[PDB]
Scaffold this active site. Structure first.
Site, PDB file in Angstrom:
ATOM      1  N   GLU A 156      32.500  37.611 -33.279  1.00 55.40           N
ATOM      2  CA  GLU A 156      33.531  36.751 -34.308  1.00 55.40           C
ATOM      3  C   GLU A 156      34.111  35.620 -34.038  1.00 55.40           C
ATOM      4  O   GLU A 156      34.216  34.884 -34.381  1.00 55.40           O
ATOM      5  CB  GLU A 156      34.416  38.150 -34.857  1.00 55.40           C
ATOM      6  CG  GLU A 156      33.547  39.285 -35.533  1.00 55.40           C
ATOM      7  CD  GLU A 156      32.985  38.623 -36.896  1.00 55.40           C
ATOM      8  OE1 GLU A 156      33.287  37.482 -37.396  1.00 55.40           O
ATOM      9  OE2 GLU A 156      32.240  39.613 -37.522  1.00 55.40           O
ATOM     10  N   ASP A 182      32.951  30.119 -49.996  1.00 58.43           N
ATOM     11  CA  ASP A 182      33.624  30.363 -51.301  1.00 58.43           C
ATOM     12  C   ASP A 182      35.249  30.056 -51.197  1.00 58.43           C
ATOM     13  O   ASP A 182      35.759  30.193 -52.259  1.00 58.43           O
ATOM     14  CB  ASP A 182      33.733  32.058 -51.586  1.00 58.43           C
ATOM     15  CG  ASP A 182      34.354  32.681 -50.402  1.00 58.43           C
ATOM     16  OD1 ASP A 182      33.291  32.974 -49.457  1.00 58.43           O
ATOM     17  OD2 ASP A 182      35.494  33.115 -50.150  1.00 58.43           O
ATOM     18  N   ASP A 185      38.372  32.970 -42.655  1.00 60.43           N
ATOM     19  CA  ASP A 185      38.384  34.015 -41.519  1.00 60.43           C
ATOM     20  C   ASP A 185      39.413  33.889 -40.621  1.00 60.43           C
ATOM     21  O   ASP A 185      39.582  32.717 -39.881  1.00 60.43           O
ATOM     22  CB  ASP A 185      36.955  34.304 -41.213  1.00 60.43           C
ATOM     23  CG  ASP A 185      36.015  34.938 -41.876  1.00 60.43           C
ATOM     24  OD1 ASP A 185      36.474  35.399 -43.097  1.00 60.43           O
ATOM     25  OD2 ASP A 185      35.057  35.006 -41.658  1.00 60.43           O
ATOM     26  N   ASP A 220      37.691  51.431 -45.245  1.00 58.54           N
ATOM     27  CA  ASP A 220      37.417  51.073 -46.933  1.00 58.54           C
ATOM     28  C   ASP A 220      36.184  51.459 -47.413  1.00 58.54           C
ATOM     29  O   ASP A 220      35.987  51.614 -48.651  1.00 58.54           O
ATOM     30  CB  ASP A 220      37.259  49.572 -46.708  1.00 58.54           C
ATOM     31  CG  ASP A 220      37.518  48.872 -48.283  1.00 58.54           C
ATOM     32  OD1 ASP A 220      38.388  49.670 -48.940  1.00 58.54           O
ATOM     33  OD2 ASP A 220      37.222  47.805 -48.643  1.00 58.54           O
TER      34      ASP A 220
END
Ligand SMILES: [Cl-]
Ligand SMILES: [Cl-]
Ligand SMILES: [Cl-]
Length: 129
Positions: free
Chosen positions: A35, A48, A52, A101
């Site tokens: 990441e 979009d 991050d 989640d």
């Protein structure tokens, strides 16, 4: 701050991530490597318009407020900039909410594509934990 591999493994373990929701420490270290390359200051813009943030590249679309992602949520109830600290606490507490989640660590695209199903224990090999 750019963490060393074992340094981050230890910090992650201290903050309760070892086997959190069943994900061994190696998974978490692997995720952070791909990441952010272990850099707490990493930011990356998504197509979009979300961004991050930090060591685990937490996305402003859902998880933090940066004030420039129209229509987004702030489910970790933090400013995105708090996820860029040399102290990983905010990123870790938010990651715990994300991974709880529904889709587990699949939320992290790099984890799914680069860590999932691999020998993740190699990421903690030789580390004093
Ligand atoms: Cl592991
Ligand atoms: Cl916003
Ligand atoms: Cl820390």
């Amino acid at each position: 701050k750019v963490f060393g591999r074992c340094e981050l493994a230890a910090a992650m373990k201290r903050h309760g991530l070892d086997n959190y929701r069943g994900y061994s420490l190696g998974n978490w270290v692997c995720a952070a490597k791909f990441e952010s390359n272990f850099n707490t200051q990493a930011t990356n813009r998504n197509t979009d318009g979300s961004t991050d943030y930090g060591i685990l590249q937490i996305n402003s679309r859902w998880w933090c407020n940066d004030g420039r992602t129209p229509g987004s949520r702030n489910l970790c109830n933090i400013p995105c900039s708090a996820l860029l600290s040399s102290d990983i606490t905010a990123s870790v507490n938010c990651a715990k909410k994300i991974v709880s989640d529904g889709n587990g660590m699949n939320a992290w695209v790099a984890w799914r594509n680069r860590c999932k199903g691999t020998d993740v224990q190699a990421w903690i090999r030789g580390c004093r934990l």
